[PDB]
């Protein structure tokens, strides 16, 4: 297992695996939804569905290729997959359809049909997908009036004002050679890829991207979307967390692993070594929860999400969870830290060593764009093993004890108390 970075004008990164049976080749750009403004929000999500449109997918399918695309807050990628003997055809398809010609894809008949399909997807997301849209509303209230607040899909109000000239204006500012990384994963050797690119003279455009002026900033706030005709309540809560390239990046992920995830209907999930589960199962305070530690280029979020049918005891669920977060400053034990070390290593090993080269192409390109290289899994395991109890207590005294929070919620949330009752539970008046 080894990565190889090489620059000749174009940054080329590979990750060779001679045991895999497919190969994957694409390009990742270093702009996401946090490089848009409130008037062209959704222009990245439209460029994805233009690339995945029917006439473009049909040209690829006669060659034997498949297409993927992903939109995030800091990056976006466009990936072609094939059998290991036809990576030259997949690199040709990325040259013709995406680099040279774009007036074929941006015809008026293709643009209006794609815009209709995207507007239906965003409408069905806002009406049916309740856990993921509460987490989207948590980002917009915590980073309000700041580039990290814009949703990755766009809104229905901002998507209908978009024309063809808005997509060409975004492509001239961000789809550049100094913003791009060419990636290759699966069964493909590194020097075979750099000689196929150098046998041509690929270059997107010369110049740099615009520089935004407002930096990300956390603000303690809340947003409530009450809907009494829904059968549950869905709540997210977080503090300000760690960015990428932070010295406390792995300590924050281990602290979330201490409290973990839960499913009340799976019998083995009920037997986990988490002390919070004693209070919750006595009166059945929720159906599921999960803790997270998200990281971006400038900021991050640390907290949990939950879903509940017990709508008269919502205040007991928030109170018991926040009293366990107080113990990370005061009285976290050594056996809880050793359990979280083994489970964080199992979770990280499953994320980076799945058998999908499309997942590996997204992870490799996003990390080379920020850091310039990639940290191996062997070196990440040695940083996790060196964390002590005193590292956890010093991190939680800075980020958790007596700090501001952000709350989002939907459904039957009448039993959720107001902000200052929840804010005062971030300290004990004992220590």
């Amino acid at each position: 297992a080894e990565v190889t970075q090489l620059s000749n004008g174009i940054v080329v990164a590979t990750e060779h695996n001679p045991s895999a049976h497919t190969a994957s080749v694409g390009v990742v750009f270093g702009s996401g939804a946090a490089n848009e403004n409130p008037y062209n929000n959704g222009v990245s999500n439209l460029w994805k569905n233009i690339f995945l449109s029917k006439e473009n997918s049909a040209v690829a399918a006669k060659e034997g290729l498949a297409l993927s695309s992903n939109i995030s807050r800091d990056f976006q990628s466009y990936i072609v997959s094939s059998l290991p003997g036809s990576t030259d055809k997949s690199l040709d398809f990325l040259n013709q359809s995406f680099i040279q010609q774009k007036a074929n894809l941006l015809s008026s008949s293709n643009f209006e049909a794609t815009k209709k399909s995207v507007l239906k997807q965003v409408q069905d997301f806002e009406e049916n997908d309740h856990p993921n849209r509460v987490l989207e509303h948590l980002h917009s209230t915590a980073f309000q009036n700041t580039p990290l607040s814009l949703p990755t899909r766009g809104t229905l109000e901002s998507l209908e004002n978009l024309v063809v000239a808005d997509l060409e204006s975004f492509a001239n500012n961000h789809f550049l050679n100094s913003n791009a990384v060419v990636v290759g994963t699966g069964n493909i050797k590194h020097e075979d890829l750099v000689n196929s690119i150098e046998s041509k003279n690929l270059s997107l455009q010369t110049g740099t991207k615009p520089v935004l002026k407002k930096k990300a900033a956390f603000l303690g706030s809340e947003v409530r979307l009450r809907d009494d005709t829904l059968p549950k309540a869905w709540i997210s809560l977080a503090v300000e967390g760690e960015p990428v390239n932070s010295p406390n990046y792995f300590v924050a992920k281990l602290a979330a692993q201490i409290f973990g995830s839960y499913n009340a209907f799976e019998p083995a999930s009920r037997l986990q070594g988490i002390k919070l589960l004693d209070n919750i199962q006595e009166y059945q305070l929720c159906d599921n929860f999960n803790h997270f530690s998200l990281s971006y280029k400038d900021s991050g979020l640390w907290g949990f999400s939950t879903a509940t049918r017990n709508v008269t005891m919502i205040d007991d669920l928030i109170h018991f969870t926040l009293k366990q977060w107080n113990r990370l400053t005061i009285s976290v034990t050594d056996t809880e830290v050793e359990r979280a070390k083994s489970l964080l290593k199992l979770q990280l090993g499953q994320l980076y060593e799945s058998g999908n080269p499309v997942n590996d192409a997204n992870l490799l390109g996003a990390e080379v764009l920020i850091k310039g290289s990639k940290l191996s899994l062997g070196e990440a395991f040695k940083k996790i093993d060196a964390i002590t109890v005193k590292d956890v207590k010093a991190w939680a005294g800075k980020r958790l004890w007596d700090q501001d929070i952000a709350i989002a919620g939907t459904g039957q949330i009448e039993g959720l108390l107001d902000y200052m009752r929840i804010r005062s539970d971030m300290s004990m008046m004992r220590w």
Partner: protein, 49 residues
Amino acid sequence: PEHDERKRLGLKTVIILSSLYLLSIWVKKFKWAGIKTRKFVFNPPKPRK
């Protein structure tokens, strides 16, 4: 006969009770500021449900 002592004890009581009154106005206005600046928005729901 208590006249000189009553006026000296009253000066300590009025000074202490005036300070507690002015501090409680500051603390009440700090703890109520989230409610006082709250905003509401109405979007009418779609029919047929």
